[PDB]
Amino acid sequence: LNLLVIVVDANPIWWGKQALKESQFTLSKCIDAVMVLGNSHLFMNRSNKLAVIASHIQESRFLYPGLLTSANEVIVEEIKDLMTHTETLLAGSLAKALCYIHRMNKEVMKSRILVIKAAEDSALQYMNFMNVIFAAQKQNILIDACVLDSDSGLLQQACDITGGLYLKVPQMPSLLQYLLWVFLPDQDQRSQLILPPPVHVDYRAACFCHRNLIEIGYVCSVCLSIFCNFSPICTTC
Amino acid sequence: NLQEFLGGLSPGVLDRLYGHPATCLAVFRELPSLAKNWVMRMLFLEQPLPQAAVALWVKKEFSKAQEESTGLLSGLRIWHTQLLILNPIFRQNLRIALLGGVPSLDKYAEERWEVVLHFMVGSPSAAVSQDLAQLLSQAGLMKSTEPGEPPCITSAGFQFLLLDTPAQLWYFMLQYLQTAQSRGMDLVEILSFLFQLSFSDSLLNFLQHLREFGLVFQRKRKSRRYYPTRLAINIVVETNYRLYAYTESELQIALIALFSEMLYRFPNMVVAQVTRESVQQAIASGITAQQIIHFLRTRAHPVMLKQTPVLPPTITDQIRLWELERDRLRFTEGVLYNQFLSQVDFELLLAHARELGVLVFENSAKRLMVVTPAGHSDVKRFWKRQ
Amino acid sequence: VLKGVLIECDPAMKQFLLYLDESNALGKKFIIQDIDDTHVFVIAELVNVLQERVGELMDQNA
Amino acid sequence: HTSRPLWVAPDGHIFLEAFSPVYKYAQDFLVAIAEPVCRPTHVHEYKLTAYSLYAAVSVGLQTSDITEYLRKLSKTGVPDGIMQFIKLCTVSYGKVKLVLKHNRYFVESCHPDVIQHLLQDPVIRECRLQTVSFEVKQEMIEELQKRCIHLEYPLLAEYDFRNDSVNPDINIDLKPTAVLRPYQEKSLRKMFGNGRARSGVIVLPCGAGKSLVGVTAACTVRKRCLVLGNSAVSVEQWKAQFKMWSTIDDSQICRFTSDAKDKPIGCSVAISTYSMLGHTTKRSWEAERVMEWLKTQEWGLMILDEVHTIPAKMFRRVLTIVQAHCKLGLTATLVREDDKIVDLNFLIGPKLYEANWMELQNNGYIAKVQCAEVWCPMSPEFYREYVAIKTKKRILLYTMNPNKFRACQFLIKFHERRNDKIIVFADNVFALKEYAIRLNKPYIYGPTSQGERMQILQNFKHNPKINTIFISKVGDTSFDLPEANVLIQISSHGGSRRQEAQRLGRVLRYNAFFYSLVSQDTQEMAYSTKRQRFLVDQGYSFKVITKLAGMEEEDLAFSTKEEQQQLLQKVLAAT
Amino acid sequence: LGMMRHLYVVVDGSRTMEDQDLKPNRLTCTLKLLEYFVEEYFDQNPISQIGIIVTKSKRAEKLTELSGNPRKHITSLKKAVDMTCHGEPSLYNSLSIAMQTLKHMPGHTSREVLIIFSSLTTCDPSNIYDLIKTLKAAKIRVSVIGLSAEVRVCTVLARETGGTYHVILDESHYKELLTHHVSPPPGNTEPGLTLGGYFCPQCRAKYCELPVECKICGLTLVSAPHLARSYHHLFPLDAFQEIRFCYGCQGVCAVCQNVFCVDCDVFVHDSLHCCPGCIH
Ligand SMILES: [Zn+2]
Ligand SMILES: [Zn+2]
Ligand SMILES: [Zn+2]
Ligand SMILES: [Zn+2]
Ligand SMILES: [Zn+2]
């Protein structure tokens, strides 16, 4: 019961940028917020499961699989190994995340995924990002999310198609208090508690040739591919 | 129960009880639904938040779960008012738990535990140990009424046999702790040792008692360090009233034959039948039918544990319906007084009878007041002196 | 003033006790005074020999 | 050890596990060997008997195919009290054969050493008059078949129909319009095993193909069939199921039920009844010239519908009047009191196929029935007189219970608002009138007519206004009751577990669900557990409804005690 | 895969809609399954339309105009339970009203009429057989679902214009007939994506939480995740050849060369619809 996957944006370009920005919030003070919430999910019930996936460039390793002192030394060893094509790939980890939930749901449970995104949203993966959302929606897997700097457009739709929450934190070093308040309760306790409402939903579509975000565009009628302001012919069919 | 035992205690022992990793994690592990959320929220706080904001953190629907949570949460004295900061003896040690500051194992654990449960039935391999024989009787599940060569089993002892494996272990330890106040040691070090086992000089004597039920293991006759077992963590039923149990152990056979009758016995499988005339033989001692369905719901086969609701509902109500045959005619005894010529004086005798709690049943036709014979001595004192 | 105890049961089962009153199967004054169609006052000595008469009637239609 | 899902008991009892991966290849083995006793959803329980192994070796498996595949599906090891029993009851099968040829009955043996053993019994010497044969009398063929079982040399009735060259092979052909379900294909495969027809008893539900198997067996042997039945209504169904699925003209399908007589001399299929062929009084002249024709022609595939009435005293004399090679028996409820179903193992033969009543429900061939034994408390005025008398007048008291009258009126109202077809089966015909006129409902009282019996039954099916009907002991057979949806059975016969498997036959012809009204704390409580004793051995679960879903809130009859006092004075005035 | 559709639903409103042999009102059991039909139509077909026409007393009255509004239809079928339904219906007046608007749609779509028809008689003031030459010319596809009998017009109206004629066994067959009318048979529109809550970019008009078109400027406003489910049918993922430690769950692709187990293999093609190695 209550398997919680944490997908941490372990992009070394943005964290190394803030490591030289002197904003008093490095990667080390963020994995500590993952590790404490990792340790705090294993306290609210006897039979609770944890998974941590780190989103790196071109690869994505599982952190925690490969009492809590046997969990925290694995995570600090893998982060010390992973951090030693300059855009993160959050969609490749959520495809790995739904595979791990589908395996642990076969060996028996309600589950949820909590994403801590730290980089800008790449629009180049809109074809594959929406597929892992509709796979998550048909298995009742919530996709919660907290961002650190800017509102990710693709990630807001994941929390409202599936049914999770979306909270942009105001401050970086106050992250650990925010995680416990709004993500540490599970699905049933989330209805009983009061929580901040979703402030904005960002629905757009990507064009097929430009892969640009579009508010007004042309769709084909047979193959249903949305195009930008051309309408010359149907490119796909 | 654990929060039942920890509720009725002094504040002077709970501050000693909150050990370094042990009890602070154990009490927090048993908190109902929302008490775990507030403990987590103000664990890293240092300034106490206002006491009126806590009731505003819950929707107006499911507000009744709030007061039963914080009543238990303030019942164990985790916070106080203070003007709701947590106890610094509890907030510190719980934050230590958030990273601050063997095939011979299980087979020994089950075999050493069945020989205690074999003592509550007929067996030649009785747990010959004079400490446990007086321990089970003062807990109230072994009737003696004699020094005796055999010890008998009371009505509560049959109810102990069909409990779950962890749930019957907690009922034993609470009656170990309630009597150890005047024969053993302090309550604090024995209870913190059990919770530390789940993850002084008097403690080896307590360890030599856990050696006999089976929760530790020595292997060299009381060496320096021990090794905990799997016990120290804290059969199909069909439509035609026939149960096929796959257990070959003699303990599980005598538990099934308490409330059923058997008709074959293969190796590794025993088929019995839940008849009407055998359930009535169980409730005659009193093993009442809610414990019967609870005994079959825990111990079940994986093929029973499928997409259907387990213990199918035509046999579970039938055991409840066979319980209600004992119930028809209830034996509640009383006494009677009647025969007043006036139609008013018995109505004045109502106001002298309801306030003590003696009246059993009221009739307004012939003015028939029935009271208990234990309370008949005081109601007549008003009648002869007016 | 009279000495006698109470018994409460189903009204269908209650008339079986009134049948045992006027048939002299167990005693003579086995019911002292009928108070209600759901509660019955019996004498205190025959409360146990009554129990196997009910337990046979529940087993006569097993 | 975790596989091989059996437990061969040392007396004989086979506990099959219906959750094993090899269950389907072990349930298609134990049907051909043993007979089912109880079949819940988890652990079945078959049973080895003497007659069940004669049906085993009649199919192509020999004595070494059974005794080896028991070891490979054992879980225990066969207990050596079954190796002595399987070997004893399989090597003594094909030694004494009963064959008829041109209106003479012959006991035949290929081994002459058993005829020198057979001809010293003083009862087989009464029925008299390599290849050793001696002719036996036809009228003592029942007392012969008891004796051959009595000394363990049983008779086989394997009609070898492929080449006989004496019978006029007719043109009955099964047309490609009736495709038969995969349980009907398995029952006929066990019957026509080695290419020769076999005389057995096939137990299929009436909502299943109880009659399509009989037609398909008639198109398979292709000889002069003869269909029997329990009633004159049941032969106008058997006439309709032959025209529907077999392409026969009306000049060959005849009848012998004293009203039609469609030239019954010289036909190919005769559909008659019991108590017409065994009518032991002076017959009419039209029936006398047919019975003189029917007593002298060797048939093939007599079809005996409703087999469980054959071991009666007058219905078992039919099997000595009519000479048939093989005798198929189709039934639905094989259970019957007085212990004469084991007597049926030599009148017809071994039990061939029993359908799994829960496998047909999980595949959609049978409606999912939700049995519910709702029992009603007794009124305190009626129980006053119930315990005072013992001589049969209290049967009216637990039948005309006012608190049972409310639960009948409530369950009728609760299913008329769901547009459900209600049938109220109710015996004890005095309380049929007093139930059906206080609710203004039609009733087939039983001595009504043949006329208004046919239009009350037709106003029930093709009319969405008339919704209930109050039958009384009429629908205890395979009648044309038109696809009911609930069945509020009230106060039927005593312990007839044949009856409540024929009342259940109306329902499966939740989707549909039937009740059973019981007046509690009376003698009907002991009766209504005797009649579920057959249905819990098929998988059905009988719930208990102690209190209905809001009975006191509607406008129910017998509210006051003044209107309840008048009903007891109506019941007690009968005496 | 499929095409756009402009379906009309003609609902009979005759005297024979008061008949039994169905849930309480024959009319009511029709309108019950139609509300189920509008939901499953708009779910599998994202950018299609529904009109609903009701014929009553020798005249046809348009109940809902032709628009892709999956809320305005169901909130109007709930109102029409209390209809009078007196008189004999028509079929010339109802197919012509479904032709004055459905003819002017662009030719890249699949214009359709669906007649749910309980009465036996179509008293209409002209010849029906000239519409069936006109409807066949305008490439409409008229299909009838009949109740209790088979009429000669509804066979020749169906087989000439191109639709189907079907008669009801019972209510389990009537739901089966309406279920077969949701699959589309095998251009460039301009819709407006409605980001920011639900507002229109072209005319900046704020309205309700809907996939509906915009009334102020006439633009259609769809939601891009609803369009997104229709993807992965085109260019779906090829299967793997299968002859431990995995790549999906971490406990064989011909593209990215990363092995899978058996749970993962079935999960990739069933629900995830992408290879977890290929996204990298
Ligand atoms: Zn473009
Ligand atoms: Zn296209
Ligand atoms: Zn607009
Ligand atoms: Zn790949
Ligand atoms: Zn895998």
Coordinates of C-alpha atoms and ligand atoms in Angstrom, one line a residue, chain E residues 237-238 240 252-258 260 274-279, ligand 4:
Chain E
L237 CA 5.2 1.0 -31.9
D238 CA 6.4 -2.1 -33.6
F240 CA 9.7 -6.9 -30.1
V252 CA 14.2 -6.9 -26.7
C253 CA 14.0 -3.7 -28.6
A254 CA 15.1 -3.5 -32.2
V255 CA 15.4 0.3 -32.1
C256 CA 17.2 1.2 -28.8
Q257 CA 18.5 -2.3 -28.0
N258 CA 17.3 -2.5 -24.4
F260 CA 12.4 -6.0 -21.3
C274 CA 6.0 4.2 -26.5
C275 CA 9.2 2.5 -25.9
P276 CA 10.8 3.6 -22.6
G277 CA 14.2 3.4 -24.0
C278 CA 13.4 5.2 -27.2
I279 CA 12.4 8.5 -25.5
Ligands
ZN4 ZN 13.1 1.1 -28.0

